Design a binder for these strands. Structure first.
Ligand SMILES: Nc1ccn([C@H]2C[C@H](O)[C@@H](COP(=O)(O)OP(=O)(O)OP(=O)(O)O)O2)c(=O)n1
Ligand SMILES: Nc1ccn([C@H]2C[C@H](O)[C@@H](COP(=O)(O)OP(=O)(O)OP(=O)(O)O)O2)c(=O)n1
Ligand SMILES: [Mg+2]
Ligand SMILES: [Mg+2]
Length: 986
DNA sequence: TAAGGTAGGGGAGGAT
DNA sequence: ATCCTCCCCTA
């Protein structure tokens, strides 16, 4: 049996480049290296430990020594300042290396052309702990501190040395030592160069592993805390960082397993032996990344707890950590990351617990997939595989494989091992198909962060790191930035974007085109030079700047019932005067513009090929991928705006965020006024998008054609066709004119309007609630899909009943109808559909009523809290009875669960609370609990339909009512309710 | 220990 | 029944 470790595997797979790499090693020649995992020694002399793959694929550890550990604080230039700081630090028993003095540009507040530079002193340390304690003491005492990354220092090293931690790096004049399977390199920052050009094929190793565990009690998830519960199988596979074919495969199991040519089978007699074999195989492979699906919630905690039970955590960790010898208490304290919070989206966070062995980066494929699909209803492996078009995994059922382990059948154990290997292969397929690792590497290169940051952290700190990286470069004059928020913070919301009260109702005659600002907030930042180093706060300083001829953008808004005013120095289209925020946003916008033009060409090449072509599907997928990429960039740039409005951010500037919002409102209103003055009608507005209709005169002559024909259905379809064409061309001309007007107004070309589609039949039901038929290049009314924004059918956790009713409403409203023919209003269509739904009740089955809700214990969502309080009481009652209550078990905090509303019999007590009516789908199907359909109707679809019908005059309030929309919505709700009781036989 | 922003619709439950 | 707060999710 040839148990090939990393070295022989690399030599076999890539022999020529392996020989070249070996020759370079003997000749001590510079060589390329891809880092993945970053580790730091915070105590004692600071050393940066990178782990990764050489050019051929050899595992390599790079130890960067003599890195300057430092942080700077701004104080006046005088010789006694150094001695005073010496005394201050020595009084706090803080050991430091040396003192330096320099000049840097503060990031906050505009300064004159000869006063950008302010004095700074740089404090050096041998250890990260001393630097951390000194930063804390100095900031508590009150000095302004910059370059003070405290939570971690590798980000500061990466941004300071211009050295991305996720890109190829060239090693020069290194100190080489081969030990075991690890080629250790001792280098210095001066001897270690970034390799940015034409990066070769990456040869990092990613192993996907899955575990199968056993519990004697049936129907329960095996608890690692339970002694009798055992992990009995581990299947693992190594792949290239870019390829889905397995370099090698290994299965470790309890029961005997028949030999399979697809993987190496390792047999163990005890759980301690199985864990030891897992550690041994991990050490022999020495992967650059260790990944699994839901491993940060199930696999890693199970393995760690079992190893603690067997008392072998120190041994297996030391074996997995290359040569990093750490004691058990240190392993539990630091390396076993427990209950780490990972932000998936807004108000959405998940838990992750894993053993971060040095030399390997842990990846949870579920975390990455949820980050890519933050609005995914189902977060299972099968759902994620289906979403991206990957092949369906042959599911291993529950009782089958627990029975198979019980029977000690060799071939059944082999089949379970095959399915576990398939699970690992699906993990790698998800990693590669979405290009997760290269995308995270690109993000790390852009933001000068490690891959670990790109995996387990959100983008706000990435925005801060990218800003500081762009700030510390001499071309910009060495802007000095802090990384931790300072100053008193307020609770509230500054004024945001402006939403135009929509002209509610269906439009079937005047085509409506959405014109959107391209990167509205970033474009405003570029145009008005919104940047903290270009910000003036005091009115007298602004007046003095006017006296010197400088153009300032003045903004004012009401925050916390007080007036916040500010002035921003305009760049005058001069690259020298361009701000830091505008510069970073120019770079990001150039990147996104390249991505957008590539996406546009790929969309125009995909539109000319019919979908049945074999090469279309994946190509279509590629299109989405590109879209996702630019979407990410968009979000990233928007984060900059948000990072100026977050009071917890180091770059927090309430005047800047308020100014961005006020400038967006002003520009939207300016374009609104200009478009209205040019005779075009406007239906709706949202932040930056304006929905504009051509004047009827522009459609006169073509209408005359339809007026001069016999007016068949195809005649009106054609008439709509050239109406949409005329729309497109008229909006193109109007967009050019509006862009020229904006250029004349603000003096820059950053603020540009853009046409994206035409919604000729379009219904606006309320603020952020509209839909229509989208025409991008040519009219196509035969598209079943509809451009939808804000309608309840797309809401997360919505019933299939609500989605079906809303889809019926919108598809009936979007139907093309000649003006001579009958044109039913939304009232009649909605009433007809609702009457069909209520009267023909049999059309709704059980699957149409499942809702989905997220269990957040810290959130007092009263309905679900009561529902699961009842479930906890029922579980207590069943355990008292001695029966199993796993079917009623509490879902783990954070995940979403499915439930239905049932008819709770009236026992004239029985509150009509939704909390007492929620039930899990499992027992509702099991016990055939009736579904309270009328509850569903009156509480979800009735309110949905009220939004559609709220535009009628009868529901309109008298002019004295301030909130016309809410009053109309409530009146429509009441009217539709009364209609329901009138039509429903009770 | 990390975690961009505000505007807004609408369900659930309780005060009242 | 009105109104209010909390919550979820979307814009
Ligand atoms: N997650 C988001 C999404 C949007 N916006 C704000 C910023 C945008 O500038 C403004 C405009 O909405 P868009 O969705 O159109 O975003 P952009 O205009 O910036 O880019 P693009 O026009 O390419 O969509 O909405 C935001 O702050 N945060
Ligand atoms: N997260 C978001 C999403 C959207 N918008 C605003 C900006 C733009 C507009 C897009 O609305 P349309 O899709 O109606 O909404 C925003 O400010 N924040
Ligand atoms: Mg499995
Ligand atoms: Mg826009």
């Amino acid at each position: 049996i040839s148990i090939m470790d990393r070295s022989e595997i690399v030599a076999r797979e890539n022999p020529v480049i392996t020989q070249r790499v070996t020759n370079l090693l003997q000749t001590n020649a510079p060589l390329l290296f891809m880092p993945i995992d970053i580790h730091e020694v915070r105590y004692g002399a600071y050393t940066l430990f990178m782990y990764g793959s050489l050019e051929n694929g050899y595992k390599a550890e790079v130890r960067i020594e003599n890195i300057p550990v430092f942080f700077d604080v701004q104080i006046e230039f005088n010789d006694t300042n150094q001695l005073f700081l010496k005394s201050l630090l020595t009084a706090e028993n803080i050991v430091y290396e040396r003192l330096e003095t320099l000049t840097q540009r503060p990031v906050m507040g505009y300064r004159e052309k000869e006063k950008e530079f302010a004095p700074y002193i740089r404090i050096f340390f041998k250890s990260l702990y001393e630097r951390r304690k000194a930063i804390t003491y100095l900031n508590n005492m009150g000095y302004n501190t910059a370059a003070d990354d405290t939570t971690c220092y590798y980000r500061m090293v990466s941004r300071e040395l211009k050295l991305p931690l996720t890109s190829w790096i060239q090693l020069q004049h290194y100190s080489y030592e081969p030990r075991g399977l690890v080629h250790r390199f001792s280098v210095t920052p001066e001897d270690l160069v970034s390799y940015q050009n034409d990066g070769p094929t990456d040869h990092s190793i990613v192993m996907a592993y899955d575990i199968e565990t056993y519990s004697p009690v049936k129907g329960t998830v095996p608890d690692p805390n339970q002694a009798n519960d055992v992990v009995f199988m581990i299947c693992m596979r190594i792949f290239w960082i870019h390829s889905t074919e397995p370099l090698a495969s290994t299965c470790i199991t309890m029961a005997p397993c028949k030999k399979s040519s697809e993987w190496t089978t390792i047999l163990c007699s005890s759980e301690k032996n199985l864990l030891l074999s897992f550690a041994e195989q991990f050490s022999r492979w020495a992967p650059d990344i260790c990944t699994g699906f839901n491993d940060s919630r199930y696999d890693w905690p199970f393995i760690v707890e079992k190893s603690m039970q067997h008392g072998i955590l120190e041994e297996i960790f030391n074996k997995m950590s290359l040569f990093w010898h750490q004691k058990l208490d240190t392993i539990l304290k630091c390396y076993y990351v427990k209950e780490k919070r990972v932000k998936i989206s807004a108000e959405k966070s998940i838990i992750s617990s894993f053993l971060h062995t040095p030399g390997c980066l842990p990846i949870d494929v579920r975390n990455m997939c949820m980050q890519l699909y933050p609005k995914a209803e189902k977060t299972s492996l099968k759902a994620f595989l289906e979403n991206c078009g990957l092949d369906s995994k042959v599911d291993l059922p529950y009782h089958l494989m627990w029975k198979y382990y019980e029977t000690r059948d060799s071939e059944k154990i082999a089949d379970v091992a095959y399915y576990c290997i398939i699970d690992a292969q699906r993990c790698q397929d998800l990693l590669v198909r979405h290009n997760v690792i290269p995308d995270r590497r690109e993000v790390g290169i852009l933001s000068y962060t490690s891959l670990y940051d790109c995996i387990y952290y959100a983008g706000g700190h990435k925005v801060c790191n990218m800003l500081i990286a762009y700030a510390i470069h001499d071309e910009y004059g060495r802007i000095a930035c802090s990384t931790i928020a300072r100053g008193k913070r307020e609770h509230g919301k500054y004024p945001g974007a402006f939403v135009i009260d929509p002209v509610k109702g269906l439009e079937q005659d005047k085509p409506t085109t959405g014109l959107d600002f391209a990167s509205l907030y970033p474009s405003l930042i570029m145009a008005y030079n919104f940047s903290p180093e270009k910000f003036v706060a005091s009115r007298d300083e602004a007046n003095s700047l006017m006296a010197k001829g400088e153009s300032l953008h003045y903004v004012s808004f009401h925050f916390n019932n007080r007036l916040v005013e500010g002035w921003f120095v305009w760049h005058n289209n001069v690259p020298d005067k361009m701000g830091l925020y505008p510069k970073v946003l120019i770079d990001l916008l150039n990147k996104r513009t390249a991505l957008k033009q590539e996406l546009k060409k790929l969309g125009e090449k995909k539109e000319c090929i019919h979908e049945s072509h074999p090469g279309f599907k994946e190509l279509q997928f590629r299109h989405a991928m590109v879209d996702a990429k630019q979407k990410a960039l968009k979000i990233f740039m928007n984060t900059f705006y948000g990072e100026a409005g977050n009071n917890l951010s180091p770059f927090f500037l309430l005047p800047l965020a308020g100014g961005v919002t006020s400038s967006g409102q002003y520009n939207l209103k300016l374009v609104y006024n200009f478009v209205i003055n040019k005779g075009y009608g406007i239906k709706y507005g949202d932040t930056d998008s304006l929905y504009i209709t051509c004047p009827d005169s522009l459609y006169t002559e073509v209408t005359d054609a339809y007026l001069n024909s016999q007016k068949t259905i195809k005649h009106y379809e054609q008439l709509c066709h050239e109406k949409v064409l005329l729309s497109m061309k008229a909006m193109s001309t109007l967009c050019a004119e509006v862009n020229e007007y904006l250029r004349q107004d603000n003096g820059t070309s950053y603020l540009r309007m853009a046409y994206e589609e035409v919604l000729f039949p379009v219904c606006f039901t309320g603020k952020k609630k509209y839909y229509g038929i989208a025409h991008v290049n040519t009219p196509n009314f035969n598209t079943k899909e509809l451009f939808i924004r804000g309608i309840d059918i797309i809401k997360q956790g919505q019933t299939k009943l609500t989605k079906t009713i809303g889809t019926r409403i919108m598809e009936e409203s979007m139907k093309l109808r000649r003006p001579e023919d009958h044109r039913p209003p939304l009232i009649e269509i909605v009433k007809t559909v609702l009457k069909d739904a209520v009267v023909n009740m049999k059309q709704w089955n059980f699957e149409d009523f499942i809702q989905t809700d997220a269990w957040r214990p810290d959130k007092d969502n009263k309905a679900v809290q009561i529902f699961m309080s009842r479930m906890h009481a029922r579980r207590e009652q069943l355990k008292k009875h001695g029966a199993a209550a796993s079917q009623f078990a509490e879902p783990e905090p954070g995940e979403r669960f499915s439930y239905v509303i049932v008819e709770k019999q009236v026992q004239f007590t029985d509150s009509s609370r939704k909390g007492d009516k929620m039930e899990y789908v499992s027992e509702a199907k099991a016990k055939n609990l009736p579904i309270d359909i009328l509850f569903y109707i009156n509480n979800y679809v009735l309110g949905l339909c009220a939004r559609f019908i709220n535009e009628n005059e009868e529901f309109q309030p008298p002019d004295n009512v301030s909130n016309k929309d809410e009053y109309a919505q409530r009146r429509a709700k009441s009217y539709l309710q009364k209609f329901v009781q009138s039509i429903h036989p009770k």
